[PDB]
Design a binder for this molecule. Structure first.
Ligand code: FAD
Ligand code: FAD
Ligand code: X79
Ligand code: X79
Lengths: 391, 393
């Protein structure tokens, strides 16, 4: 059969599979024992009470950017690195419209890797800083051009950045963008992981969005790719940043079934099911659990069990959103688990698209970060396991 | 179809370089007016920079700064303080782009109940001294942007007419907000039908927004001024720059168009606004101009362009709740410029607030926005009082 026929067919079949059909296997995989659920509720309660206790109970988003340049961002990272946080730097900029813009973004990433690699100073991919890139920044027609043209021009660029990251032994993560570019980005991940020029480096990383119906099947493909390539792929599990745009796009596409879930707790169930899959594959992937939701965090912390070492998995958060929560996580007296801060770098000329996504995240009534400040939402509701709502 | 309607259609994607010469000419003020406006603008900006207005005051992503109240009852109670200072209100029941019939029905009921509450609170103060309402057509039809324009207008007309009839019963203003460029024509057709509908005779509260970032703006205004004159309706015309610029650019880039329906340089929108303000100020007999802006230079220019004669009902300024108060506290009142300002006042929950908040973020966060520049240490007062006609190059 075609290479990985079964795994690839499962991804395509899930693309727009009816939401009601996607959920039952996720619910089962996300169901944890009463004893674990009780312990997780206690941890989530503590995290929420501590969050408010230490923070007395901005739209312009200056708090979301770590620096205007990589040199400035690296200087401002020393304090939290001393405490046990790590960083992933994001040179802001996406959706290049011209070939010249794509070349400028490439050069920004290239210079950033040199600076980050020098700052890392041999700390390696888990304890030291890394970089995150967006494929839409590196091809001028990313959303519109045929995959053959995008691949043939994007692959040499991404390979070159990955080689530089290998040379400094830092992480290089491909951020996940709109649903219609998942397939191309995954094909690119495969080619890079099988490229012998990158052998010996486990810093290649890839995001999977749990609001997407394909998420568990993409994870199956990635875990199998790790096994056959010999690369321990860093896998950032997120819920997803483009929900409002995906809903609008699917409506304008005339779709009867969308590529993302439309009930928020379904995304939560999907995230926990996929975390269970990742936690069973830590021999071949490095799970990175990106979330600001204290209930999600506590559920994964207890799911992962008592055995931990740095390099087994980590949590992640966004700069300007997650530090209060993760100050109750990192460190021996807390949960003794590491957290990597995603750290945007740039100016107003490149901040807009990201800030809009942060407003849609922070301003939505369904978001944990909004509900924690909502007087109508009890602590009981914040710590409730969403899997029990649909079980 | 008419010569005036044809001028609108022909301008839709007219090349930007062709649109500008007539706007530059119309936006050119005499030296005496320019000097007076520079003096007024400098005074306003010096006062603003003694305050802490602009984008830095936008508050948190909870959006608390931008919503007047959760219900119309709450919002009406909170309006008494600023009403006696010389402000009026236009209440906006938040909600837009209905996707289902149930949503469009809920938004209709929200608007209807707001009109009853606002009209009762107005207590016969009329359309200028008393509060009004603003509506979005996309809230009232479940496929506003995705269905054929003719059929959309036909189902929308009875609903908007029913709301207009309630507004007439209480003698309050009812304004149709302007949304995306591809729906200007439909909304303008609806306005014309309403203004020729004898059931609405004797009421001057029908209002309509025109966006100066659009290439059709002056020709829309010519059509509306003529419609007011021939129908006997003193149409309330809210002149804005526009709230959807980033989305219009993105759609136009995807549509593969060489020529967009909006200007692409901020200074061109500024020139367009001043040119269109000149057109409106020449037509105060038949339309009620409402100059919506937070830009102190724009305001000062219009204040001097309007001349010395003023009475309530001639024209007004407008601002958004949570953005315009620092500026307009230097405008309303007998100790200031003695001109009225109507506050656009969103009313709703956090849920219905999100889309409006995104447009406020794009407005407040853009380096090109007056409200961002007023707080920017790199931007001089000299730059803030520059006349757009004298800068454009
Ligand atoms: C370090 C880091 C890196 C990230 N990288 C990426 C990336 O590369 N690509 C990407 O797309 N996202 C990425 N994200 C995720 C995104 O930016 C949000 O931070 C994240 O989705 C919020 O989830 P949460 O668990 O913190 O919050 P929660 O409040 O628990 O979850 C909110 C999320 O639920 C989802 N949602 C909301 N409403 C609905 C609904 N009606 N139906 C279904 N789902 C709904 C959305 O995904 C929303 O963001 C990243 C996040 C972090 C912290
Ligand atoms: C009471 C009130 C009601 C309003 N109602 C509506 C409405 O119904 N519909 C609507 O669309 N808008 C409406 N607006 C306008 C919108 O919400 C903004 O408030 C307004 O455009 C900002 O203009 P300004 O003069 O305050 O600021 P300025 O800083 O002087 O102008 C900013 C504006 O310039 C324009 N712009 C920015 N960059 C560019 C560029 N590169 N090229 C071209 N133009 C550019 C945009 O329109 C932007 O909002 C309303 C505004 C107010 C105050
Ligand atoms: C968060 C993150 C990384 S990708 C989506 C975004 O930039 O918002
Ligand atoms: C402002 C205003 C009225 S219409 C556009 C928007 O709601 O942002």
């Amino acid at each position: 059969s075609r290479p990985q026929s079964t795994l690839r067919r499962a991804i395509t079949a899930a693309y727009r599979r009816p939401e009601t059909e996607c959920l039952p296997p996720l619910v089962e995989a996300a169901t944890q024992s009463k004893e674990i659920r009780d312990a997780a509720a206690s941890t989530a309660r503590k995290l929420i009470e501590a969050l408010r206790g230490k923070h007395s109970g901005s739209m312009m988003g200056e708090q979301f950017v770590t620096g205007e340049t990589i040199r400035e961002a690296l200087k401002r990272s020393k304090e939290l690195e001393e405490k046990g946080f790590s960083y992933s730097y994001d040179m802001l900029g996406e959706a290049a419209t011209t070939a010249a813009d794509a070349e400028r973004y490439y050069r920004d990433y290239e210079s950033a890797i040199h600076a980050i690699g020098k700052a890392s100073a041999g700390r390696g991919i888990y304890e030291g800083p890394g970089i995150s890139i967006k494929l839409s920044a590196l091809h001028p027609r990313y959303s519109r051009a045929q995959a053959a043209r995008v691949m043939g021009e994007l692959l040499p660029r991404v390979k070159a950045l990955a080689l530089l990251a290998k040379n400094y032994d830092i992480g290089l993560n491909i951020d996940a963008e709109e649903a219609d570019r998942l397939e191309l980005s995954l094909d690119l991940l495969e080619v890079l992981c099988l490229d012998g020029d990158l052998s010996g480096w486990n810093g290649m990383g890839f995001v999977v969005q749990a609001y997407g119906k394909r998420c568990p099947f993409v994870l199956d493909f990635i875990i199998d790719l790790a096994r056959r390539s010999g690369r321990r792929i860093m896998v950032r599990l997120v819920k997803g940043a483009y929900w409002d745009a995906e809903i609008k796009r699917a409506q304008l596409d005339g779709l009867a079934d969308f590529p993302v879930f439309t009930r928020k707790i379904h995304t939560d169930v999907s995230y926990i099911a996929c975390a269970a899959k990742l936690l069973a594959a830590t021999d071949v992937v490095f799970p990175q659990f990106a979330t600001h939701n204290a209930q999600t965090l506590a559920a994964i912390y207890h799911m992962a069990g008592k055995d931990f070492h740095v390099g087994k998995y980590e949590f992640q958060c966004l700069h300007g959103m997650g530090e209060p929560l993760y100050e109750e996580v990192v460190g021996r007296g807390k949960l003794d688990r590491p957290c990597r801060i995603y750290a945007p770098v740039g100016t107003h000329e490149t901040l807009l698209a990201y800030l809009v996504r942060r407003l849609l995240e922070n301003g939505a009534n369904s978001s944990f970060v909004h509900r924690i400040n909502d007087p109508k939402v009890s602590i009981d509701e914040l710590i409730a396991d969403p899997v029990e709502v649909v079980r």
